[PDB]
Amino acid sequence: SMDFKTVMQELEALGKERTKKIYISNGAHEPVFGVATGAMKPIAKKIKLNQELAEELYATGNYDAMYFAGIIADPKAMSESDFDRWIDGAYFYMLSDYVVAVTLSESNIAQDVADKWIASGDELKMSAGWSCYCWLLGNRKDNAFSESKISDMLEMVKDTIHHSPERTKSAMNNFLNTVAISYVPLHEKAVEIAKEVGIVEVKRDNKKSSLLNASESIQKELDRGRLGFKRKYVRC
Numbered sequence: 001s002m003d004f005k006t007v008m009q010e011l012e013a014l015g016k017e018r019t020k021k022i023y024i025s026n027g028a029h030e031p032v033f034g035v036a037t038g039a040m041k042p043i044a045k046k047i048k049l050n051q052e053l054a055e056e057l058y059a060t061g062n063y064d065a066m067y068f069a070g071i072i073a074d075p076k077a078m079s080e081s082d083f084d085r086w087i088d089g090a091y092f093y094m095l096s097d098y099v100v101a102v103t104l105s106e107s108n109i110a111q112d113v114a115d116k117w118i119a120s121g122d123e124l125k126m127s128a129g130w131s132c133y134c135w136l137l138g139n140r141k142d143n144a145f146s147e148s149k150i151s152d153m154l155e156m157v158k159d160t161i162h163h164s165p166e167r168t169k170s171a172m173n174n175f176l177n178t179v180a181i182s183y184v185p186l187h188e189k190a191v192e193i194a195k196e197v198g199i200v201e202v203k204r205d206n207k208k209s210s211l212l213n214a215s216e217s218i219q220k221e222l223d224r225g226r227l228g229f230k231r232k233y234v235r236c
């Protein structure tokens with residue numbers, strides 16, 4: 001089986017300065033190699049699932065190694081304590097939202113852990129918990145969710161998005177868009193909440209704010225005929 005040193009060498013060889021620049025622009029810090037996710041497919045196909053190696057890779061603090069650790073993890077064997085370790089190391093949103101939340105969405109304890117995270121009051125843990133719901137609404141049938149719980153979550157986003165921490169706002173906006181398209185029981189309420197919320201401004205260090213517009217984004221998906229569509233998050 002592939003060892004830690006060999007994976008780290010292969011990932012460093014795939015790093016490109018362009019991809020790296022972008023990751024650093026988004027909040028990654030050294031060490032980081034800048035590996036495009038599709039370039040990971042052959043290494044991931046060799047390894048399949050290996051929790052031990054995922055743990056060593058996540059501990060590097062190297063964003064690309066940490067991303068790859070999520071692809072090779074065994075989330076059905078990870079405990080709540082394991083996910084709390086991983087979220088403690090997720091130092092910016094690409095880790096919280098695209099690595100830990102996606103690994104969590106593939107576990108058997110996703111909603112329980114995401115709910116705790118949403119309740120935590122900590123920017124990136126809450127971002128991971130809202131993000132995990134977006135990934136679950138694309139990889140689960142509707143009957144995996146309580147309609148009243150999702151409705152109460154939409155109301156929480158309406159009532160509190162504009163005074164939430166910046167990265168939390170991005171993930172709650174993603175939740176509005178994802179409920180409107182991928183959770184048809186509350187399609188109409190999500191559309192109306194999006195209209196009530198309006199533009200959501202995500203302030204960012206080192207670049208301009210992002211002005212999100214969930215009403216627009218939902219309308220683009222409706223224009224494409226995607227009401228009801230559920231997309232499993234694509235990792236690589």
Ligand SMILES: [Cl-]
Pocket residue numbers: 161162163169199200201202
């Ligand atoms: Cl806002």
